[PDB]
Amino acid sequence: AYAALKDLTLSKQDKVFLEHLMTEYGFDSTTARQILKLKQGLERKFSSIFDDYTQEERDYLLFRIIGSVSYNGVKWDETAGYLSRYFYKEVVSNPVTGEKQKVPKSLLDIFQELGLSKAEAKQLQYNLSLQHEMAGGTLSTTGDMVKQDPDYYETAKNSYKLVYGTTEGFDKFWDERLKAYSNDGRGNADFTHQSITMATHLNPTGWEGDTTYNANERKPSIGEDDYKADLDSVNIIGRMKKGQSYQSAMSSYYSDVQKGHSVREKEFLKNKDWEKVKKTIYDSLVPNGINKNADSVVKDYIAKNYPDVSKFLSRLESVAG
Ligand SMILES: [Ca+2]
Ligand SMILES: [Ca+2]
Ligand SMILES: [Ca+2]
Numbered sequence: 001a002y003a004a005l006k007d008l009t010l011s012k013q014d015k016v017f018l019e020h021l022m023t024e025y026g027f028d029s030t031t032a033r034q035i036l037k038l039k040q041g042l043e044r045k046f047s048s049i050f051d052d053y054t055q056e057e058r059d060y061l062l063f064r065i066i067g068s069v070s071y072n073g074v075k076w077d078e079t080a081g082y083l084s085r086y087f088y089k090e091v092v093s094n095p096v097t098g099e100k101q102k103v104p105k106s107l108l109d110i111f112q113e114l115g116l117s118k119a120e121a122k123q124l125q126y127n128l129s130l131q132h133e134m135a136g137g138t139l140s141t142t143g144d145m146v147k148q149d150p151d152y153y154e155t156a157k158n159s160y161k162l163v164y165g166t167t168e169g170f171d172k173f174w175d176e177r178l179k180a181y182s183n184d185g186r187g188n189a190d191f192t193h194q195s196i197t198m199a200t201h202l203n204p205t206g207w208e209g210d211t212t213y214n215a216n217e218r219k220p221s222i223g224e225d226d227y228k229a230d231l232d233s234v235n236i237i238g239r240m241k242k243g244q245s246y247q248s249a250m251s252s253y254y255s256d257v258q259k260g261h262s263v264r265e266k267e268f269l270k271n272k273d274w275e276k277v278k279k280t281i282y283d284s285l286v287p288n289g290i291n292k293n294a295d296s297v298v299k300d301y302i303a304k305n306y307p308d309v310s311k312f313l314s315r316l317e318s319v320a321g
Pocket of ligand 2: 271
């Protein structure tokens with residue numbers, strides 16, 4: 001655990017970054033180092049010294065690629081941007097003409113272009129999806145899965161063998177990852193959710209989608225994993241806009257979160273007006289028959305019908321004063 005990061009052969013800044021990935025989301029050193037490998041591939045592919053790209057574009061690409069594990073399809077391409085603009089293979093499309101066409105690269109092929117081996121790419125994708133599904137603390141140990149949903153258990157087991165090549169150790173692995181990714185059931189930030197939120201905010205062309213009736217999703221849904229992801233997206237993007245890279249801003253932010261008190265909520269309320277947040281959620285969730293000025297009535301309505309959004313409001317209200 002501690003023993004893994006002594007030798008390495010990473011800058012002090014990179015080790016700090018790896019440790020934040022591990023602490024905040026639950027990744028072990030193996031997965032965290034694979035995420036660092038992706039980032040290093042982006043710097044080799046999109047230079048600011050030998051080419052034209054910027055650090056913010058490289059940070060966007062990292063968020064966009066990690067997000068695509070869980071958020072894909074044309075609805076997300078229009079929203080967070082098309083990865084095919086940056087990752088493709090060209091093939092002769094008409095043998096007589098010589099005309100070529102650019103064929104979009106799959107997510108696993110993007111991972112390998114950026115430096116991961118085929119096995120590393122499969123492991124990274126799997127662990128990013130696991131963290132995404134487990135972060136909210138709604139999933140079960142294999143021991144409870146067997147009894148409750150035996151078909152989900154054998155499905156999950158098959159996915160693990162697909163990745164690692166064996167069924168051996170699935171129960172121990174799943175239970176170990178469930179404790180780490182879910183923060184022992186209490187909730188960690190949903191990393192792919194945070195990533196696609198940040199990618200969307202950095203696309204040249206979050207909490208609001210999760211707290212309102214937007215079309216696409218399951219209505220409002222803001223479990224603890226999305227609460228942290230949504231607020232941390234806004235906070236870290238804000239630090240980046242002030243001049244920091246993603247690695248610097250997230251390192252400074254998670255350090256500050258540890259050193260302070262309710263820093264996640266206080267910093268969110270400095271980026272987003274508490275009254276605008278309240279108003280956005282009220283207009284979307286509260287029917288016109290309820291006087292929105294009668295704040296005690298509204299809070300009891302939300303508390304009864306949207307317990308997750310209620311906690312979201314209670315936590316911010318608490319720090320708004
Ligand atoms: Ca989530
Ligand atoms: Ca402000
Ligand atoms: Ca209801």
